[PDB]
Amino acid sequence: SYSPPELEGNAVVSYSRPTERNPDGIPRVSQCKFRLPLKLVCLPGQPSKT
């Protein structure tokens, strides 16, 4: 029922680089954030005076 604090969302990938020192791979993390539109949480409605 309540509207979210912000429409932005995050997406995070955690992967591994296989290296000679650690054949199992050093873990790295990288992220990107998208911006959602008002058309997902709002609608055009009637306005009030006060």
């Binding site: 000679e20 650690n22 054949p23 199992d24």
Partner: protein
Amino acid sequence: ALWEDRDVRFDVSSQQMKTRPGEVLIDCLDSVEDTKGNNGDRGRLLVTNLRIVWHSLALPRVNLSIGYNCILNITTRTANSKLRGQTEALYVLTKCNSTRFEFIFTNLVPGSPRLYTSLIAVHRAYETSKMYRDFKLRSALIQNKQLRLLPQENVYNKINGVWNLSSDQGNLGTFFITNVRIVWHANMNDSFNVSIPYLQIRSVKIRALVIESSQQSGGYVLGFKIDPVEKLQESVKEINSLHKVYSANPIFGVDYTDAFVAYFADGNKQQDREPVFSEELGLAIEKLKDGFTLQGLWEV
């Protein structure tokens, strides 16, 4: 003549590490560090056809050569957990001319430990095949009436009525000639058979079929006598031909300094005092060392 599979040598030359004619390399692994000698130096491990070799890979002079007829136990130790990958280690226990050594081989890079498996395999192949390169008396060679052949062995000449000039009354027996070894059973209580390998033969001459052993089975002179000597010289010449054509490229039937002092399995001990009786325990016990007593060695 052949020492690669009979001794354990340290600081071996760059030539004796090279594959002998009958030998053949199987598997190799770099960066195998040597331990039980705390030099902390890397190397390279080789599991050949007759022996295992390790050379320092940076100072290739210092090295180790361990024969397969001089190893007793080979143990792989998988440890050194999550902190890094599961690395293995090889523990080899060796006993050459009554002296016990132990070598440890640590795979530094945990990305290739497969070697330690194949070694075990080939070692079995080394022990399951000793009728190819060793001399044996009175073994279980004969089937109902014929010879039980090794894997890579077929008979050449099948001669009946070949005597043995080492006994008195149990002589007349068949003589089997093969490409790996020559055998003679007794045709009467056929458990007096001798199976001489071409590897142990030193020279086949006549004085009568005299066969000498190559200083490993002792000076075992074997004398046989046959029917009129035509077939006799025929057999001698064909035996010499087979001996030479084998010695050209040996078979081995394997299917598929102070360096010593830092590798003792006991610890500052290369010895075994004369085993004498023990009135205390009732067992044959090693002689005690100049003042020591059993009930004083036992307690703490």
